Symmetry: C15
Subunit: 82 residues, 15 copies
Amino acid sequence: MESNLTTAASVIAAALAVGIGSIGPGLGQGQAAGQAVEGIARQPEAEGKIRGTLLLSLAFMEALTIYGLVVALVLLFANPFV
Amino acid sequence: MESNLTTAASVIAAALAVGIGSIGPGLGQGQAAGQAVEGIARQPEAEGKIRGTLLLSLAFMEALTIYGLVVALVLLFANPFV
Amino acid sequence: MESNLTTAASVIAAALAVGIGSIGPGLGQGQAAGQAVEGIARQPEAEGKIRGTLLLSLAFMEALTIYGLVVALVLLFANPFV
Amino acid sequence: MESNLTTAASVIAAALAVGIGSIGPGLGQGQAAGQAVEGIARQPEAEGKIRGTLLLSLAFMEALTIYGLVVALVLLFANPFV
Amino acid sequence: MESNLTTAASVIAAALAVGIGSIGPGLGQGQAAGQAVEGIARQPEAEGKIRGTLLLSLAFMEALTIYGLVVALVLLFANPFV
Amino acid sequence: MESNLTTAASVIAAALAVGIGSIGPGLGQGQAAGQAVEGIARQPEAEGKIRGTLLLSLAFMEALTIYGLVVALVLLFANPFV
Amino acid sequence: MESNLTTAASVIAAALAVGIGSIGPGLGQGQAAGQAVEGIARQPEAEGKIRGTLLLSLAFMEALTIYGLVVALVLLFANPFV
Amino acid sequence: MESNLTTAASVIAAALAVGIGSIGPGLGQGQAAGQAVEGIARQPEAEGKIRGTLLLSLAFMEALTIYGLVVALVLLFANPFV
Amino acid sequence: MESNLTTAASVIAAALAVGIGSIGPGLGQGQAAGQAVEGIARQPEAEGKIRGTLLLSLAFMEALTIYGLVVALVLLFANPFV
Amino acid sequence: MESNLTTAASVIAAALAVGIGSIGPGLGQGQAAGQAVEGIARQPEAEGKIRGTLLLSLAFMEALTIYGLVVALVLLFANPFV
Amino acid sequence: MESNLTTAASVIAAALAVGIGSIGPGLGQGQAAGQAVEGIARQPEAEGKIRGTLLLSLAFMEALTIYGLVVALVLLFANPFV
Amino acid sequence: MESNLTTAASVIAAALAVGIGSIGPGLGQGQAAGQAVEGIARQPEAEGKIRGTLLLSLAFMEALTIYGLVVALVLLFANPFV
Amino acid sequence: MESNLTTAASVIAAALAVGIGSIGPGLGQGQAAGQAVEGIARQPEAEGKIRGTLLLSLAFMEALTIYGLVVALVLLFANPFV
Amino acid sequence: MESNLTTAASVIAAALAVGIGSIGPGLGQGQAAGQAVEGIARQPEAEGKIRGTLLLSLAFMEALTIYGLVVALVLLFANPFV
Amino acid sequence: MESNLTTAASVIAAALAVGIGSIGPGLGQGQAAGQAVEGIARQPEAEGKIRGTLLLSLAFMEALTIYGLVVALVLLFANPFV
Ligand SMILES: OC[C@H]1O[C@H](O[C@H]2[C@H](O)[C@@H](O)[C@H](OCCCCC3CCCCC3)O[C@@H]2CO)[C@H](O)[C@@H](O)[C@@H]1O
Ligand SMILES: OC[C@H]1O[C@H](O[C@H]2[C@H](O)[C@@H](O)[C@H](OCCCCC3CCCCC3)O[C@@H]2CO)[C@H](O)[C@@H](O)[C@@H]1O
Ligand SMILES: OC[C@H]1O[C@H](O[C@H]2[C@H](O)[C@@H](O)[C@H](OCCCCC3CCCCC3)O[C@@H]2CO)[C@H](O)[C@@H](O)[C@@H]1O
Ligand SMILES: OC[C@H]1O[C@H](O[C@H]2[C@H](O)[C@@H](O)[C@H](OCCCCC3CCCCC3)O[C@@H]2CO)[C@H](O)[C@@H](O)[C@@H]1O
Ligand SMILES: OC[C@H]1O[C@H](O[C@H]2[C@H](O)[C@@H](O)[C@H](OCCCCC3CCCCC3)O[C@@H]2CO)[C@H](O)[C@@H](O)[C@@H]1O
Ligand SMILES: OC[C@H]1O[C@H](O[C@H]2[C@H](O)[C@@H](O)[C@H](OCCCCC3CCCCC3)O[C@@H]2CO)[C@H](O)[C@@H](O)[C@@H]1O
Ligand SMILES: OC[C@H]1O[C@H](O[C@H]2[C@H](O)[C@@H](O)[C@H](OCCCCC3CCCCC3)O[C@@H]2CO)[C@H](O)[C@@H](O)[C@@H]1O
Ligand SMILES: OC[C@H]1O[C@H](O[C@H]2[C@H](O)[C@@H](O)[C@H](OCCCCC3CCCCC3)O[C@@H]2CO)[C@H](O)[C@@H](O)[C@@H]1O
Ligand SMILES: OC[C@H]1O[C@H](O[C@H]2[C@H](O)[C@@H](O)[C@H](OCCCCC3CCCCC3)O[C@@H]2CO)[C@H](O)[C@@H](O)[C@@H]1O
Ligand SMILES: OC[C@H]1O[C@H](O[C@H]2[C@H](O)[C@@H](O)[C@H](OCCCCC3CCCCC3)O[C@@H]2CO)[C@H](O)[C@@H](O)[C@@H]1O
Ligand SMILES: OC[C@H]1O[C@H](O[C@H]2[C@H](O)[C@@H](O)[C@H](OCCCCC3CCCCC3)O[C@@H]2CO)[C@H](O)[C@@H](O)[C@@H]1O
Ligand SMILES: OC[C@H]1O[C@H](O[C@H]2[C@H](O)[C@@H](O)[C@H](OCCCCC3CCCCC3)O[C@@H]2CO)[C@H](O)[C@@H](O)[C@@H]1O
Ligand SMILES: OC[C@H]1O[C@H](O[C@H]2[C@H](O)[C@@H](O)[C@H](OCCCCC3CCCCC3)O[C@@H]2CO)[C@H](O)[C@@H](O)[C@@H]1O
Ligand SMILES: OC[C@H]1O[C@H](O[C@H]2[C@H](O)[C@@H](O)[C@H](OCCCCC3CCCCC3)O[C@@H]2CO)[C@H](O)[C@@H](O)[C@@H]1O
Ligand SMILES: OC[C@H]1O[C@H](O[C@H]2[C@H](O)[C@@H](O)[C@H](OCCCCC3CCCCC3)O[C@@H]2CO)[C@H](O)[C@@H](O)[C@@H]1O
């Protein structure tokens, strides 16, 4: 439909946002979850407390990548320039 | 068949979204799963609890890359510009 | 629908702010959350204390990425130039 | 035959999607599998439980690279542009 | 209503300030907070003292990123050149 | 009997697919196999169970690189463009 | 308004000074703070001594990034050239 | 004796396939082999079992680089384009 | 107001001097301070001796970045060329 | 004798093949050999079994670089293009 | 006053000298100082000997960055070319 | 005296072959030799056995770089193109 | 006052020699000095022996950077070309 | 005198051969030597055996960098082209 | 009295030779020396033997950098081309 410098930059930008935005949170979620299951193996009676604190933490980390997602979707479906 | 800057940028962007988007979650899932199976060996009685928490964690990490896949699929099958 | 150097630079900027801005906080939140759940497994009675300090920590780290998000939203929705 | 910026970008993209897409899952699968076999050596009686959990994990990680494969295959066999 | 070298540089600059500016502090805050919750589990009676010292530390680290935010906001809302 | 942008890109692409595609799986397979032989030395009666789980794991990891090989072979023997 | 090579370089420089300038101090402050809270958990009676030493340390590290802030502020509000 | 972009790209491609394709497998084979000989020293009677699992592992890893070699040989001896 | 190659290089140089110049000293101060507060917890009676040696060390590290600041300030307020 | 893009690329390619191709195998051989001599010091009666398994492993790793060598020699002595 | 390739290179060079020149010495001073205060906590009667050896070591490391400083000051105040 | 693209590429290639080709083997030999001398200290009676296995290993690693040297010497003294 | 490619290259060269030339030695001196003070704390009576070996080591490492300084001084004060 | 692409490439190559060529052997020699002196402290009676094995090792590693020196010297004193 | 491609390359080359050439040996010398002083503290009667083996090792490592220095001095004082 339309191709210019800004449409080209928009699609690259969208991919960088979600692609790069998943690096930190992906690693961090693995580290937290790993400690969680180790803790459960160590003390199964704490499973409830452990899972609750993990779920909360997973949400904070997941939100970081969702910010990248939000930008991607704006660049694609509500682009202010093109 | 159309080739312009933006179609070219779109196909590259699609690949970077899923390619880069798999790095953190891939490493993270491995870390979490490794601790899970170590935990099951340590306390086989807790495997039900461990497996459920692991599954929850894997989902949160898988979703991060799936955001990448959504962007890629938008660029390829619902491209707003080209 | 305007395309120039600045609109293109703006979309790339928006993605870099939130993309790069999640790396450190994503990793850091994972480190903290991991220690939290390991602490809960060690001393389930300290769960309230651990959760409260974790939450406060997660907020400080989340805010770091949110500054990136704010910049991205300004560039997309309140751009001073284009 | 057809050769333009987009066909060239499409073949490079396809390689990057599966090439880069296998890095994190490759490492992660090794980490999880290594811990699985260490766990089986430690508690051979837990082999069934460990193998099931590992299998689930390997699938989650494999899927990440498969999203890359899908993008590659679309680019080579169902290209929307070129 | 304005596009030139310096408007383009300003938007990239704003993103780099807060994007890069969150890497060290993000990682550092995670390290400190992780030790804090581990400390609380170890010695719950010291929670108040630990929490107070952590809060101070988190503020010092958060400030480093805020300096980035300040540069970004000057560039966006009080730009000296454009 | 043919040289253009896309033939040149295709040959580089083929190399990157299998070249980069072997890094993660190569490292991961070494990690898993190392733990497997350490496990066998520790508990030789579990060799069969360890060997079976390792074999499955090696296949999952090998497949990641084979996806690269497949893209490379499509580019060389069934190229869609040139 | 003014736009030339030096204004563009000045805004980028300002971002780099505070952005890159926060990396080492950010990490270092986390390392020191983490050890401080671990020490307080170990010897709560030493909290006053530990907090004083930590505070002095945090100031030394904060100052490093502030030198970056100063350069940034000179560049934006007291630029010698442009 | 033909020289064009594609013959030049082909020779570089051939070298990158086998060059890069040995990195992960080279490292991985070392890791596995190291654990194998350490296992043999710990339990010399398990040598047959350790050797057999090592060999199978080495083959899986060697194959990863061989795919790179195959691509290089196709590019040198059965080039589809030039 | 003068803009040339050298004014542009000067402002960038100023930022790189203090920005890069803070990396090693920032990390180094954190390492030293971390060991100091650990030492005070271990032997509160030695805090006077520990604090003095730490202060001496922090100064030596702070001076390294201050050299960067001197160069930056020369480039901005006593520039020999522009 | 003859100089064109392809002769120039051929000589660079040759050097990259053997140069890069020695990185992984060089490190991996050191790791395996290191474990081997440690194992011999631990259990000198196992020297025969250890050395045999090491020799086999060294051969698999050495072959990875020889693949790079083969490509180099082809590019130099049996070049298909120039 | 004067702007040419060499004045521009001189100011960049000056900043690289002190900026890069502080990386190694900054980290090394932190490592040595960290060990020093740990040693003092361990054996406070050795404070004199420890501090003396540390001071000497700090001087050797500080001199490395001062070499960079010397070059910077020459490039700025005793430039042989411009 | 002839200077063209290919002579220039040849001299650079020669250096990259031996320069890069020494990295993995250099580090690998150090690792293996370090474990060897540690092993001799642990069991002086085994030094004959350790020295022989080390020598075998060093040779395999030295050969990897020698391949680099062969390529370099071919490029300098038996160049097929120039 | 001459400006050409070589004077500009010379000033950059001078800075790179001393800048880069301090990285390894800075880190190495820190490692050695750290072990020295830890050794003095362990055995204060060996202080003379430790100090003497440290000093000799520091000189060897300092000399490495001094070669960089010498090159920088030749380029600034005894330039063979410009 | 002579100046062309090949003389310029030759001087850069010579620097890269010995510069890059000393990285792996430099690190490796330190690793081996460190273990040698640790071993002598542990079993002083084994000093002769350890020193002989170390000497052999240092020679193997030194030779790697010497291959770089040889290429450099050929390029500067026996250049085949220029 | 001379400026061209090769004079410019020669000065950069001289800096890279000694700059890069000091990284590995600098790090390696620190590793070896650190172990030496730790060894002396552990076993002061072995100081002579440790010191002798360290001296030999430091010479081997120092020589690697001297090769760089030699290339640099040839380029500055006995340049074969310019
Ligand atoms: O809006 C841009 C207009 O400018 C064009 O010039 C060309 C220009 O010469 C060329 O350097 C430019 O390609 C170079 C731009 C780099 C691609 C960019 C890099 C990162 C961000 C995503 C992609 O493309 C323009 C085509 O969009 C054409 O003159 C015109 O058709 C086009 O519409
Ligand atoms: O035949 C010209 C066609 O291409 C134009 O874009 C030009 C553009 O101007 C030019 O700079 C560009 O060369 C620039 C190469 C940059 C490669 C780019 C890097 C990241 C993003 C993906 C790939 O080539 C395009 C050729 O397709 C127009 O976009 C298009 O309308 C037109 O159909
Ligand atoms: O600024 C307005 C002008 O935009 C275009 O300029 C563009 C041109 O299209 C583009 O290929 C070229 O891009 C060069 C690559 C830089 C792109 C930029 C880099 C940072 C991240 C955002 C993307 O540079 C020109 C900069 O002026 C065209 O010159 C013209 O169509 C239009 O008037
Ligand atoms: O006029 C439109 C032009 O479109 C293409 O030109 C292209 C040309 O192929 C390409 O090598 C050149 O640089 C293209 C950039 C390098 C290839 C690209 C890099 C990123 C990954 C995908 C592959 O730019 C030209 C456009 O600026 C056509 O191939 C060319 O024939 C034609 O002149
Ligand atoms: O001072 C602003 C000036 O910007 C343009 O000049 C520039 C223009 O940016 C672009 O085409 C080209 O540079 C564009 C590439 C640099 C993009 C930059 C990279 C890092 C910082 C963010 C984005 O060179 C032109 C040289 O004339 C216009 O040509 C000029 O009319 C306008 O006055
Ligand atoms: O579509 C293929 C076209 O390829 C050429 O265009 C290209 C050509 O590749 C080359 O000179 C130049 O780009 C060559 C540089 C890019 C090489 C590429 C980099 C990554 C992928 C592998 C190799 O730009 C030209 C722009 O016209 C020819 O000029 C054109 O006639 C031909 O049709
Ligand atoms: O004639 C003097 C020129 O001065 C500037 O041109 C500049 C132009 O702006 C710039 O994009 C282009 O490339 C400038 C390099 C990219 C921007 C720079 C990169 C490092 C960090 C600071 C930002 O070069 C032109 C000069 O060679 C003016 O902006 C331009 O209008 C004018 O043509
Ligand atoms: O493709 C055929 C043509 O080959 C040459 O093109 C070449 C040219 O020689 C070269 O300097 C230039 O190379 C540009 C650098 C890219 C080289 C390529 C990069 C990836 C790995 C392989 C090497 O690009 C042109 C691409 O078309 C010449 O244009 C011409 O003699 C010949 O007709
Ligand atoms: O309007 C032209 C003015 O700029 C000239 O320098 C030109 C220079 O020739 C040109 O290559 C340059 O574009 C080159 C862009 C390189 C950016 C550079 C990268 C590191 C150092 C800081 C930024 O732009 C300048 C524009 O200011 C002259 O230096 C000055 O006398 C004159 O006033
Ligand atoms: O076969 C290439 C033909 O093309 C030439 O153009 C020039 C071209 O302008 C220039 O960009 C090109 O240099 C740029 C190519 C980059 C060198 C390449 C990069 C990686 C792979 C190894 C080396 O060299 C060509 C010389 O071979 C000449 O026109 C002709 O003499 C030559 O034979
Ligand atoms: O002494 C340099 C003379 O050459 C100029 O050309 C321009 C040239 O076109 C342009 O590529 C060049 O900018 C490119 C040079 C890159 C900047 C350099 C990179 C690292 C070291 C520090 C900074 O700048 C020149 C301006 O100094 C002008 O023609 C003249 O005004 C100037 O005096
Ligand atoms: O005087 C021209 C001579 O050089 C030509 O090659 C040209 C070539 O076209 C040009 O792009 C090239 O500039 C390209 C610079 C690329 C540097 C290259 C990067 C990696 C490989 C080693 C160095 O310069 C050559 C100058 O020797 C021809 O190859 C040769 O026949 C001729 O004798
Ligand atoms: O060598 C003498 C000539 O110096 C200038 O050439 C310069 C030009 O100014 C510059 O923008 C351009 O620089 C290009 C960037 C490389 C700069 C160099 C890179 C390594 C570290 C030192 C800095 O290249 C030309 C190289 O000939 C001008 O051409 C001219 O004013 C003068 O006669
Ligand atoms: O016409 C043949 C040309 O051959 C040389 O030009 C050369 C020129 O020297 C060089 O700076 C330019 O870029 C050369 C690339 C940068 C230097 C090279 C980079 C890799 C490591 C070795 C050093 O390319 C020209 C050829 O394209 C001669 O020096 C020049 O006088 C002559 O114009
Ligand atoms: O052989 C030396 C020749 O050097 C120049 O050519 C060169 C000149 O270096 C420069 O402008 C340009 O290349 C300059 C960029 C390369 C700088 C180099 C990068 C790595 C090594 C250190 C510095 O290309 C010209 C091509 O003609 C002169 O133009 C020529 O008259 C002179 O004879």
